[PDB]
Amino acid sequence: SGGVYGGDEVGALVFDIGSYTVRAGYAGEDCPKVDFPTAIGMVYYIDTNALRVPRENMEAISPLKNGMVEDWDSFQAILDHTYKMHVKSEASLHPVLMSEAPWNTRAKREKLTELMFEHYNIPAFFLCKTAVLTAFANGRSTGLILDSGATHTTAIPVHDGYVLQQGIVKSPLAGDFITMQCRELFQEMNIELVPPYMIASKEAVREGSPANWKRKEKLPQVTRSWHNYMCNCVIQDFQASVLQVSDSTYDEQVAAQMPTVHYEFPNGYNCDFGAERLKIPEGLFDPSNVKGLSGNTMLGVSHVVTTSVGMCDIDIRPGLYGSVIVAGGNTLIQSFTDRLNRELSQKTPPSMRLKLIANNTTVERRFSSWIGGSILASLGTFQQMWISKQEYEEGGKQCVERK
Amino acid sequence: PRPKSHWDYLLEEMQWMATDFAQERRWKVAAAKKLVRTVVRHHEEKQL
Amino acid sequence: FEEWFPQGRPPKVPVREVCPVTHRPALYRDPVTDIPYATARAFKIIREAYKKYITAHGLPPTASALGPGPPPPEPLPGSGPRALRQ
Amino acid sequence: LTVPQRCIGFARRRVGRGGRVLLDRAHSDYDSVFHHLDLEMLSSKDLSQILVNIKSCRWR
Amino acid sequence: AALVVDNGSGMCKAGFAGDDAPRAVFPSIVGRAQSKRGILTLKYPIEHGIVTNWDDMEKIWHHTFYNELRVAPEEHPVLLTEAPLNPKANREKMTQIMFETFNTPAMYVAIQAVLSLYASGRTTGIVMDSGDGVTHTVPIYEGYALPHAILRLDLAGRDLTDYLMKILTERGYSFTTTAEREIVRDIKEKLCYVALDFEQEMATAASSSSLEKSYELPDGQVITIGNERFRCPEALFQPSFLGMESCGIHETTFNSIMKCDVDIRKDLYANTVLSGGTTMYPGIADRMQKEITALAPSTMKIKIIAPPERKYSVWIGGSILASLSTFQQMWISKQEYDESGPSIVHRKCF
Amino acid sequence: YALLYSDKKDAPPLLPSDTGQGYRTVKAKLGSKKVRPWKWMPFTNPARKDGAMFFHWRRAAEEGKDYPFARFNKTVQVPVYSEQEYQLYLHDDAWTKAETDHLFDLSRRFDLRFVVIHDRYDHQQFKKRSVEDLKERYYHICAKLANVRARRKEQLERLYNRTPEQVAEEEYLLQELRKIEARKKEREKRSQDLQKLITAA
Amino acid sequence: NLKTLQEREARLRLEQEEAELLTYTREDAYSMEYVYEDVDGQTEVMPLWTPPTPPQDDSDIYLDSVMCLMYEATPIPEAKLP
Amino acid sequence: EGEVTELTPCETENPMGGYGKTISHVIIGLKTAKGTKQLKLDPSIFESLQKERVEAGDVIYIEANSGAVKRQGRCDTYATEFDLEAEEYVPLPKGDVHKKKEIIQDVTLHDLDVANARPQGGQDILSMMG
Ligand SMILES: Nc1ncnc2c1ncn2[C@@H]1O[C@H](COP(=O)(O)OP(=O)(O)O)[C@@H](O)[C@H]1O
Ligand SMILES: Nc1ncnc2c1ncn2[C@@H]1O[C@H](COP(=O)(O)OP(=O)(O)O)[C@@H](O)[C@H]1O
């Protein structure tokens, strides 16, 4: 047994581009060695460190709007900076396996392929969907890829490795909503403050008492959008630290009796949220009484999944319900997976097997797309599907029929 | 009925690679845990 | 305390010698060359190599024998610390 | 296993990258009763080893 | 028996496992042929912690194997080290050249940060590795280096030496050439300590001359270094002095910790360990502790640990790992490489 | 209890790797051999369908061996009819030449995955079609081609009976599904009573 | 002495919670095969999960496993009427 | 039974008397094919250990109640092919360290009669003529 048919590893720099955080890394590896914010400090500074140093303007902008790249200049800048700094690998030295959303337009896809084959001259390229990779990451050919990115929640189903484009449900509920609600709650109870970006030093503060600190005399940073991003940073920190998802219909009788939890703001202001820390992660599943939009009509996570299942043929639903694939950042919140499982079980029609893949223990759910991309690249049979430079220079440059 | 196409074997190889990656991640984690624990135990033993 | 309890290190598990001419489990140890061997042909080749070596300061080439698939090293540097026969 | 004389529990042979063969494992029945099951494969906690399985343990 | 060779930029560190310190330490510079100072075509292949050209790399391998040490690599296993973000191609090529050229019986590649953590004897924490050409903050949990949380800072002892040259030349000292850059580096390693609360330390040094200290050059020249002693290494905390626009070491460490998974960052803060020769500045530990306590929450119990063997901590960790019995089963046997190839270096890690 | 079945991995498990310990024990075992040179050489896969060439880790001893996985590219058996063949045999009223060509292109691209075909089917250029309809059309065309060149009868009515009934079942409300389960339990009780009766006789 | 025994037992327990075994002894297990005998004395070979083998002919008919979730097979006899 | 790793954890002198150096327990690291298991045996057996050539790396045959040590021989793992000796190297024990060997012996009453009839053990019985 020589294992000649094991697999092949030929470059394939996977670049999973995401609205909250972009990911990258070589194929064959299990975890992406590159993970930094996606928003660039456009005056271009794109790095976990460069994006935290005060300068003249440094306006924050995310090239991907609704998961769709629109500002090609900023996208090219991000790619070039990533390569040069983290990878240090020549552009035209290794292929690329960038990922895309299931709702990528044909014109935008062709433009991405052109940018890949013209300014970088990479030896080969292949653009696979994010849901497909997320499914391959879990070794699943059929299932519901419940993406919960920072700007969209979509239960995309896949059939035999192919995404069902008509089954996607782009629910606005996402991390941005949770962050906005947390910002509103803070502004209601206290004043949201910038991270240490401006705080010179903190002091001891009694729980619930006003905090005292020293202001830095650095640049004013008139750009409010940058201040908004710096505040969203702390908002996301709060969300991932203490914010917890309810486990029931969220009646106002049990939450008042649960244990209390603490949290310290950048300035040292200590406050407890044990009473309403689970009020914000409610619209995700029950968007019926959210204070922000009381007269809205949205579908929760379970509702989105049920709709995505129903909009597709019934012949595949047995393989969709039984292989629900939870992914994305929002899911790492405490009790999120359990609440989702409970809601789907009480909602899903009995006699149909419902199984939630046990992958919430680790934070690898975010990187599921990159893991699936690296897995696909490491395959030997897949080595023929790459869009080589010859196929592009020939004149076709048609990724629709080839993908 | 129809014969297995290219993608039919590609998906099997993909599942194989996925389970391989899944096993290898946990193997690396367990090996690293073993190494750190053995090193700290050796340090404590040397001090004792 | 030391006499009744000789706290010595483990026995330092020995090396699993192998025949350099046939790469099989060595069964014997050539006295003059002090290198393990397992067959009479191996012994003859080892004696010839030792004669060629002692002839000059050090044999520039290295005797080859039964080269398997992978590149055989043809071990000359298997130093025999034993001196001349007598 | 071959050199060891202890039952590692439920396992399956699998080929990995580079032609190397791996042996995945699973957890069940506290993972302790199987370590003692060697007395049943070499030849309550005694009948349980015979009931949980049909003595279909892989030799060598 | 098992050899340990740490690919540390600036100066290579090699020796035998089990020893409490490296036996061979020399500048990691090769000229084409000779790896010693002189008027030649010397060049740095590992400037920023990544091998640039493999010719000089194989040359320095042969050197550290046969000239510095007197052991045959084909008879002893070599424990190599790699940067926490070492690309795949470079690791594969290193494994290839090490298995083919020198015919080593076995080898193993380990993250320098994990080796320094072993040397510190901690189960978790952030390894603020600061070589001569690059700096890294590698959070570690149960030995896993958390690659997604690793952040890289592109300043190190080389840039500090350059800035010290610039400052002492502006003050009127002859430090514009390499023959003087060596004396400047000597000053930086011996003199040029770090002082906490620079805003007040510089004021005191300017008001009182007690901080002025004299230095004697080889040619008999004498100069006094004062307030600018700790201004040079201050770039580590305020890269603005160096001219670049990156975050400081403490800010980079805070960012790395924040990127780490929740429910464990407490143990990370509680085990912030320093590493690298660039951390040998006296008093840097207290400055790091204070600035991290200022940044990190007040309720967090920050604890800076920095053994006196910072410069060689990675080598001590490599020696400990090699001497470790349980680690013996992780060596990359020769037959494994022969049957699988250089890709075997990927598997059997961590 | 019984043996376990799992695809990827369980919660606490762990797999053993190979041995590389006891270098002293195996010192001479591996010291008497060398390593076959591995080279980052370029390889050309004949299944590329073009002149592109990539690299791969292989030993220098087999510079040939174009590609092992090349023999996995088995294309599905999809007939390729001409325009005259369609005009003479496959002419239809509801369908048209362009629509049949698009259907066959989708089939060849997705390997007879009618579900993915319908999913990606261009409902704009051509009016809505159902999966069973596409299957019926494809099988009819294949049968006609196989006949004129000189496999099993396809019944769209069956798919017309399976999918809607199964959908109506999947849409069983909670109360009516519980009532159906109760009726099933009652029928089981009646069967048990009949068994008791026939046994007592 | 009782406290020392307790702490020693605790320490030993901690050691058992990291990893029992981590190697496979490739020397023999790598190439050697596995076989067992059931209660009835019947023999069976250990199936090792290998990658997909190269198909030399048109065999290995497409199975569509995802469809088997509700269907098992097709019997020979049927209703046999219009 | 199993490969022995002798070690005596130093303990404070007899607390009933003065001070000095004593040994309250003697730990023997019996290693078997299935695993390792250290036994904190009684210290009085130390005399038996020193009596026989019980060195680290050999197989010993311990008894629960009696405690007498009977070395079987060194482990075959150390039996280098170049070492010329027999009856000194034995294979490692297969199974757990603690083994409860149950053996049944069927002997007729006449067998016991004959066994108890003639003598055994010294007494100049080695004579041939008489
Ligand atoms: N357009 C997108 N497509 C796919 N994934 C996305 C997209 N935008 C964001 N994500 C993922 O969603 C996550 C949002 O992070 P967030 O939920 O705020 O983190 P946490 O809740 O764990 O603190 C990111 O980790 C990112 O990987
Ligand atoms: N006495 C000293 N104190 C602090 N830093 C020093 C001292 N001497 C040298 N250095 C700097 O610290 C660095 C230590 O180098 P090293 O740790 O080998 O780099 P690497 O981390 O790449 O191995 C040197 O390269 C030098 O620039």
The continuous run of DSSP H or E covering A228 comes out as: helix A224-241
Please, are residues A101 and A16 in contact by the beta-carbon 8 Å criterion?
Answer: no
Please, are residues A259 and A274 in contact by the beta-carbon 8 Å criterion?
Answer: yes
Query: Rounded to whole angstroms, how far apart are CA atoms E337 and E347?
Result: 11
Q: Same domain for E117 and E254?
A: yes
Q: Same domain for E232 and E343?
A: no
Smallest CA separation from ligand 2 atom 8, residue: E189
Structure tokens at F6: 């799992």
Please, are residues A15 and A91 in contact by the beta-carbon 8 Å criterion?
Answer: no
Residue of A31, A136, A364 with shortest CB distance to B14: A136
CATH number of the domain where residue E341 is located: 3.30.420.40
Q: Which atom of ligand 2 is nearest to the CA of E10?
A: 25
Q: For this experimental structure, what is the resolution in angstroms?
A: 3.2
Q: Same domain for E102 and E120?
A: no
Query: Rounded to whole angstroms, how far apart are CA atoms F152 and F162?
Result: 19
Check pocket membership of A366 for ligand 1, CB cut-off 6 A. yes
Which residues fall within 8 angstroms of residue E86, CB to CB, at 6 or more apart?
A: E50, E109
Query: Rounded to whole angstroms, how far apart are CA atoms A292 and A180?
Result: 9
Domain containing residue E305: 113-154+248-313
Q: Residue F67's CB: how many other CB atoms inside 10 A?
A: 19
Amino acid residing at A344:
L
Per-residue b or e along E133-142, where b marks 16 or more CB atoms closer than 10 Å to that residue's CB: bbbbbbbbbb
CB < 8 Å to F68, chain G: 54
Which is nearest to F71 in space by CA: G55, E319, A61?
G55
Which residues fall within 8 angstroms of residue G18, CB to CB, at 6 or more apart?
A: B30, B33, B34, B37
Query: Rounded to whole angstroms, how far apart are CA atoms E144 and E260?
Result: 12
Please, are residues E93 and E86 in contact by the beta-carbon 8 Å criterion?
Answer: no
Distances (CA, A) of A205 to A195, A212, A267, A334, E156: 17, 8, 9, 28, 37
Distance of CA E158 to the CA centre of its chain: 12
Query: Rounded to whole angstroms, how far apart are CA atoms D34 and D49?
Result: 7
Which residues fall within 8 angstroms of residue E123, CB to CB, at 6 or more apart?
A: B36, B37, B40, E142, E143, E267, E271
Nearest-ligand number for the alpha carbon of A232:
1
Q: Which residues pair with A60 in a beta bridge?
A: A41
Q: Residue E219's CB: how many other CB atoms inside 10 A?
A: 8
- For chain C, which chains pass the contact test of at least 3 CB pairs under 8 Å? F, H
Domain containing residue H40: 1-115
Q: Same domain for E322 and E341?
A: yes
CB contact under 8 A, A139 and B10: no
Q: Same domain for E41 and E169?
A: no
CB pairs under 8 A between B and D: 11
Physical contact, F and E (3 or more Cβ pairs within 8 A): yes
Q: Same domain for E291 and E217?
A: no
Residue of C5, C6, C26 with shortest CB distance to H81: C26
Query: Rounded to whole angstroms, how far apart are CA atoms E9 and E157?
Result: 10
DSSP letter for A135, please: H
Query: Does the CB of D46 have a partner CB in chain B at under 8 Å?
Result: no
Using DSSP's 3-state secondary structure scheme, residue D39 falls into helix
Overall domain count for chain E:
3
Q: Same domain for E228 and E275?
A: no
Q: What are the backbone dihedrals phi and psi of residue A271, each rounded to the nearest 5 degrees, phi first?
A: -150, 150
Torsion angle, alpha carbons of E345, E348, F4, F7, to 10: -30
- For chain D, which chains pass the contact test of at least 3 CB pairs under 8 Å? A, B, E, F, G, H
Q: Same domain for E133 and E84?
A: no
Check pocket membership of A18 for ligand 1, CB cut-off 6 A. yes
Smallest CA separation from ligand 1 atom 9, residue: A149
Physical contact, D and E (3 or more Cβ pairs within 8 A): yes
Query: Does the CB of F10 have a partner CB in chain B at under 8 Å?
Result: no
> Of E221, E246, E271, which residue is a domain's last?
E246
CB < 8 Å to E344, chain D: 18, 20
Query: Rounded to whole angstroms, how far apart are CA atoms A292 and A283?
Result: 10
Check pocket membership of A239 for ligand 1, CB cut-off 6 A. yes
Please, are residues A11 and A123 in contact by the beta-carbon 8 Å criterion?
Answer: yes
CB contact under 8 A, C14 and F24: yes
Which residues fall within 8 angstroms of residue A25, CB to CB, at 6 or more apart?
A: A13, A14, A31, A32, A33, A34, A370, A374
Any idea which residue has 């699998």 for tokens?
A: D14
Please, are residues E345 and D18 in contact by the beta-carbon 8 Å criterion?
Answer: no
Check pocket membership of A150 for ligand 1, CB cut-off 6 A. yes
CB-neighbour burial class of residue A402 (10 A; exposed 0-12, middle 13-18, buried 19+): middle
Q: Which residues pair with A153 in a beta bridge?
A: A148, A171
Residue of F26, F28, F36 with shortest CB distance to C71: F36
Which is nearest to F16 in space by CA: E343, A379, D6, H3?
D6
Query: Rounded to whole angstroms, how far apart are CA atoms A146 and A168?
Result: 10
Please, are residues F58 and F39 in contact by the beta-carbon 8 Å criterion?
Answer: yes
DSSP letter for A83, please: I
Query: Rounded to whole angstroms, how far apart are CA atoms A150 and A18?
Result: 9
Long-range Cβ contacts of G60-69 (<8 Å, 24+ apart): G60/B3, G60/B4, G61/B1, G61/B2, G61/B3, G61/B4, G62/B1, G62/B2, G62/B3, G62/B4, G62/B5, G62/B8, G66/A141, G66/A142, G66/A159, G66/A160, G66/A316, G66/A318, G66/A319, G67/A315, G69/A318, G69/A319, G69/A322, G69/A353
Q: Give ∠ CA G71-G74-G79 in degrees, rounded to 5.
A: 115
Q: Which residues pair with A21 in a beta bridge?
A: A37
Q: Same domain for E259 and E211?
A: no
Which residues fall within 8 angstroms of residue A152, CB to CB, at 6 or more apart?
A: A19, A66, A67, A170, A171, A172, A174
CATH number of the domain where residue H94 is located: 2.40.50.360
Q: Same domain for E56 and E188?
A: no
> Of E188, E216, E246, which residue is a domain's last?
E246
The end-to-end CA distance of chain A, in Å, is 34
Please, are residues H50 and C4 in contact by the beta-carbon 8 Å criterion?
Answer: yes
Q: Same domain for E179 and E67?
A: no
Check pocket membership of A329 for ligand 1, CB cut-off 6 A. yes
DSSP letter for E148, please: G
Q: To the nearest whole angstrom, how far is the Cα of D6 from the nearest Cα of chain G? A: 10
Q: To the nearest whole angstrom, how far is the Cα of F128 from the nearest Cα of chain D? A: 46
C-alpha atoms less than 13 angstroms from C-alpha of A58 in its C-beta half-sphere: 21
Query: Rounded to whole angstroms, how far apart are CA atoms A56 and A53?
Result: 10
Q: How was this structure determined?
A: cryo-EM
Please, are residues E332 and E345 in contact by the beta-carbon 8 Å criterion?
Answer: yes
Query: Rounded to whole angstroms, how far apart are CA atoms F7 and E114?
Result: 32
What spacing in Å lies between the alpha carbon of E276 and ligand 2's midpoint? 6
Q: Same domain for E240 and E336?
A: no
Q: Where are the alpha helices (DSSP H) in E208-312?
A: 228-231, 249-259, 265-269, 284-295
CATH number of the domain where residue E183 is located: 3.90.640.10
